[PDB]
Amino acid sequence: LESVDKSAGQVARNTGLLESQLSRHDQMLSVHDIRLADMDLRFQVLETASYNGVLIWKIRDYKRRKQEAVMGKTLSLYSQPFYTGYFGYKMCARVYLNGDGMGKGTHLSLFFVIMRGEYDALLPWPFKQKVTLMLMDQGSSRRHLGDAFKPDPNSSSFKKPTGEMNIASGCPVFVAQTVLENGTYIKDDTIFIKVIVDTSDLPDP
Amino acid sequence: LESVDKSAGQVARNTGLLESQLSRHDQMLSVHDIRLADMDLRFQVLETASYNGVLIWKIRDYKRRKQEAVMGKTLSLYSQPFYTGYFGYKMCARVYLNGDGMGKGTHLSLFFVIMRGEYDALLPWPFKQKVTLMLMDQGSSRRHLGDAFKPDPNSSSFKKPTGEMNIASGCPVFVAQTVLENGTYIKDDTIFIKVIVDTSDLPDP
Amino acid sequence: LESVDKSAGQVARNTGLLESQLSRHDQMLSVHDIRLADMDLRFQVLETASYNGVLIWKIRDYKRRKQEAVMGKTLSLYSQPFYTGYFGYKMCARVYLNGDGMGKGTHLSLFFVIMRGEYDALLPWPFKQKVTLMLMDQGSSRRHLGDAFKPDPNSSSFKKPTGEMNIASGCPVFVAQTVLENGTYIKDDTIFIKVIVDTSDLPDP
């Protein structure tokens, strides 16, 4: 099949087109597989987003999530974004299941992060709404763990968001693990952190 | 082509790879076809969800939907979920276009279902918000059909949601079909059911 | 290969099946590529939708967007829909970066469009909520450009939406370009238009 190999039998090239087309759809299905994946989160963050300044966050797998904090597989966790109004300050909270800073290894870390809103430019600065971060008690009628605080105008943690998330400024030694793990708070391998940024004293239309 | 069949001509195996790859993308496109499908609903339930305790539901195809009730192709219809607040009690309503129970075949059935919220554990029980379920009148200025009621603490229809939807506890003989079909209420093969779970008398932050 | 061509060698038909299957997935991936695309917008319009009657719209690329107005590549821009309530009047605004009508080529055009709501039939007509359309000032502490107005019951621009968007009835000569371009308002190739449809004087449950 000398002067007839590529002649009679050049199907070996036709097979080259099938494969290429196959390689094309392989990438698309994949890109599409990833695209689809970001939709859930996008729905997920939206289904759980609040626009009244208040926020209730949920953390499942505290154990499988706590064990990763200790083994440094994921030092912190962020909450779904939330707002003070439909077009107001954008925010969220940051946590460390196995503490950090002065409360590291012996506490729960909970910070308040002033994210970069899409509507920044029409709002007042520096941010100045009082805050209240708490640990929710899921007991018969016990009490939750809270601690409010007012931003430091001086702090560059409360200014018009240049980069993505502002600088996390909460509490290093919020609550001792030996207290949260030894109590209701943890129920069914999960807990809930609350956040109450005042918006009332800022007439909401 | 004895000792040369699978030798010279084993393309019949190469064709086995193209097909398999083809069978792989066939499943993905399909799974992806179904995934995409659930997004609409997910958007649809969200685009129509209310967080102020009130709810306006819409039912199109009353006829093609009523005829299936009679021919037992779909005895009831559920509404989009709704809430009393951003992180409050989750709910929704249930209907029977061709009645059920004592109003079966001669009435419209409308129930109030206390679904299992994602935020159950931080809320008060048993549920105790008064309710008002009504049939909206689309007439020049006529009146709608309503009937409020207060949960029975005794009832296991108003407790912290173990399974998915709580136990449907509304009204079997809400309105007679011969009254809804013989009146404005039905306009352009559709109707709207309203629901007013009190939330006011529960200071909403 | 006379009476054996299609006989021994009819792989040329087998290759016809691979391709067809390939052509099938080609269309699906594409349809799916477009479907995925509409989700973003659907999320995008939702992430930015307001249900309190107020609205803050954002227009990026004013220049690349203004230059198209002059070269007639896109005479106007529409905002994300918005409402007065969860099930209230649906609306939005219309703009012309290079004016239109009496303010054409020398002004910014901003109209108020009463869209066709999904919940039209249960609401009061003709629409009668005062309106306030303004141009937001992104300056150190300057002022924005506003101008309220009350619908004309006479106008067929404020009635129960037959077709899609009602008839755009705003202001042709809202603000002179030479004033908006020569001032803060434009910052980082973008601007923001505001809209304040009264809803307060319509007890919102």
Coordinates of N, CA and C in Angstrom, one line a residue, chain A residues 102-175:
Chain A
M102 N -4.8 36.0 70.2 CA -4.8 35.7 71.7 C -5.7 34.5 72.1
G103 N -6.8 34.3 71.4 CA -7.7 33.2 71.8 C -7.4 31.9 71.0
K104 N -6.3 31.9 70.3 CA -6.0 30.7 69.5 C -5.8 29.4 70.2
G105 N -6.4 28.3 69.7 CA -6.3 27.0 70.3 C -7.2 26.9 71.5
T106 N -7.7 28.0 72.0 CA -8.5 27.9 73.3 C -9.8 28.6 73.2
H107 N -10.1 29.2 72.0 CA -11.3 30.0 71.8 C -11.9 29.9 70.4
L108 N -13.0 30.6 70.2 CA -13.7 30.7 68.9 C -13.5 32.2 68.5
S109 N -13.0 32.4 67.3 CA -12.7 33.7 66.7 C -13.9 34.2 65.9
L110 N -14.4 35.4 66.1 CA -15.5 35.9 65.3 C -15.3 37.4 65.0
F111 N -15.0 37.7 63.7 CA -14.8 39.0 63.2 C -15.9 39.6 62.3
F112 N -15.9 40.9 62.2 CA -16.9 41.7 61.3 C -16.1 42.3 60.2
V113 N -16.4 41.8 59.0 CA -15.7 42.3 57.8 C -16.5 43.2 56.9
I114 N -16.1 44.5 56.7 CA -16.8 45.5 55.9 C -16.3 45.3 54.4
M115 N -17.1 44.5 53.7 CA -16.8 44.2 52.3 C -16.9 45.4 51.3
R116 N -16.5 45.2 50.1 CA -16.6 46.3 49.1 C -17.9 46.2 48.4
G117 N -18.8 47.1 48.7 CA -20.1 47.1 48.0 C -20.1 47.5 46.6
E118 N -21.1 47.1 45.9 CA -21.2 47.5 44.5 C -21.7 49.0 44.4
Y119 N -22.4 49.3 45.5 CA -23.0 50.7 45.7 C -22.2 51.6 46.5
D120 N -20.9 51.4 46.7 CA -20.1 52.3 47.5 C -19.8 53.5 46.6
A121 N -20.0 54.7 47.2 CA -19.8 56.0 46.5 C -21.0 56.8 46.8
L122 N -22.1 56.2 47.1 CA -23.3 56.9 47.4 C -23.6 56.9 48.9
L123 N -22.8 56.1 49.7 CA -23.0 55.9 51.1 C -22.0 56.8 52.0
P124 N -22.4 57.0 53.3 CA -21.6 57.8 54.2 C -20.4 57.0 54.9
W125 N -19.3 57.7 55.1 CA -18.1 57.2 55.7 C -17.4 58.1 56.8
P126 N -16.6 57.5 57.7 CA -16.4 56.1 57.7 C -17.6 55.3 58.2
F127 N -17.7 54.0 57.9 CA -18.8 53.2 58.4 C -18.9 53.5 59.9
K128 N -20.1 53.6 60.5 CA -20.2 53.9 61.9 C -21.4 53.3 62.6
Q129 N -21.9 52.2 62.1 CA -23.0 51.5 62.7 C -22.5 50.6 63.9
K130 N -23.1 50.7 65.0 CA -22.7 49.9 66.2 C -22.9 48.5 65.7
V131 N -22.2 47.5 66.4 CA -22.3 46.1 66.0 C -22.6 45.2 67.2
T132 N -23.1 44.0 67.0 CA -23.4 43.0 68.0 C -23.2 41.7 67.4
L133 N -22.1 41.0 67.8 CA -21.8 39.7 67.3 C -22.1 38.7 68.4
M134 N -22.9 37.6 68.2 CA -23.2 36.6 69.2 C -23.2 35.2 68.7
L135 N -23.1 34.3 69.7 CA -23.1 32.9 69.5 C -24.5 32.4 70.0
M136 N -25.3 31.8 69.1 CA -26.6 31.4 69.4 C -26.8 30.1 70.2
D137 N -27.5 30.2 71.3 CA -27.8 29.1 72.2 C -29.0 28.3 71.8
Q138 N -28.9 27.0 71.4 CA -29.9 26.1 71.0 C -30.5 25.3 72.2
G139 N -30.5 25.8 73.4 CA -30.9 25.1 74.5 C -32.3 25.4 75.0
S140 N -33.0 24.5 75.7 CA -34.3 24.6 76.2 C -34.8 26.0 76.5
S141 N -33.9 26.9 76.8 CA -34.3 28.3 77.1 C -33.1 29.0 77.7
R142 N -31.9 28.5 77.4 CA -30.7 29.1 77.9 C -30.4 30.5 77.2
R143 N -29.2 31.0 77.4 CA -28.8 32.2 76.8 C -27.7 32.1 75.8
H144 N -27.6 33.1 74.9 CA -26.6 33.2 73.9 C -25.4 34.0 74.3
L145 N -24.3 33.9 73.6 CA -23.1 34.7 73.9 C -23.0 35.9 73.0
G146 N -23.1 37.1 73.6 CA -23.0 38.3 72.8 C -22.0 39.3 73.3
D147 N -21.7 40.4 72.4 CA -20.8 41.4 72.8 C -20.8 42.5 71.7
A148 N -21.4 43.6 71.9 CA -21.5 44.7 70.9 C -20.2 45.5 70.9
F149 N -20.1 46.4 70.0 CA -19.0 47.3 69.9 C -19.2 48.4 68.8
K150 N -18.5 49.5 69.0 CA -18.7 50.6 68.0 C -17.4 50.9 67.2
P151 N -17.4 50.9 65.9 CA -16.2 51.1 65.1 C -15.3 52.2 65.5
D152 N -14.0 52.1 65.2 CA -13.0 53.1 65.6 C -12.9 53.9 64.3
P153 N -13.3 55.2 64.2 CA -13.2 56.0 63.0 C -11.7 56.0 62.5
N154 N -10.8 55.9 63.5 CA -9.4 55.9 63.2 C -9.0 54.7 62.4
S155 N -9.5 53.5 62.7 CA -9.2 52.2 62.1 C -9.5 52.2 60.6
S156 N -8.5 51.6 59.8 CA -8.6 51.5 58.4 C -9.4 50.2 58.1
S157 N -10.2 49.7 59.1 CA -11.0 48.6 58.9 C -12.4 49.0 58.6
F158 N -12.7 50.3 58.7 CA -14.0 50.8 58.6 C -14.0 52.0 57.6
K159 N -13.5 51.8 56.4 CA -13.4 52.8 55.4 C -14.0 52.3 54.0
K160 N -14.2 53.2 53.0 CA -14.7 52.9 51.7 C -13.8 51.8 51.1
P161 N -14.3 50.6 51.0 CA -13.6 49.4 50.5 C -12.8 49.5 49.2
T162 N -11.5 49.6 49.3 CA -10.6 49.7 48.1 C -10.5 48.3 47.5
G163 N -9.9 47.4 48.2 CA -9.8 46.0 47.7 C -11.1 45.3 48.0
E164 N -11.1 43.9 48.0 CA -12.3 43.1 48.2 C -12.9 43.3 49.6
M165 N -12.5 42.5 50.6 CA -13.1 42.5 51.9 C -12.2 43.5 52.7
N166 N -12.9 44.4 53.5 CA -12.1 45.3 54.3 C -11.2 44.5 55.3
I167 N -10.7 45.2 56.3 CA -9.9 44.5 57.3 C -10.7 44.0 58.4
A168 N -10.7 42.7 58.6 CA -11.4 42.0 59.7 C -11.1 42.5 61.0
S169 N -12.1 43.1 61.7 CA -11.9 43.7 63.0 C -12.9 43.3 64.0
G170 N -12.8 42.0 64.6 CA -13.8 41.6 65.5 C -13.4 41.3 67.0
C171 N -13.1 40.0 67.3 CA -12.7 39.6 68.6 C -12.0 38.3 68.5
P172 N -10.7 38.3 69.0 CA -9.9 37.1 69.0 C -10.3 36.0 70.0
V173 N -10.6 36.5 71.2 CA -11.1 35.6 72.3 C -12.6 35.9 72.6
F174 N -13.4 35.4 71.6 CA -14.8 35.6 71.7 C -15.4 34.7 72.8
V175 N -15.3 33.4 72.5 CA -15.8 32.4 73.5 C -14.9 31.2 73.5

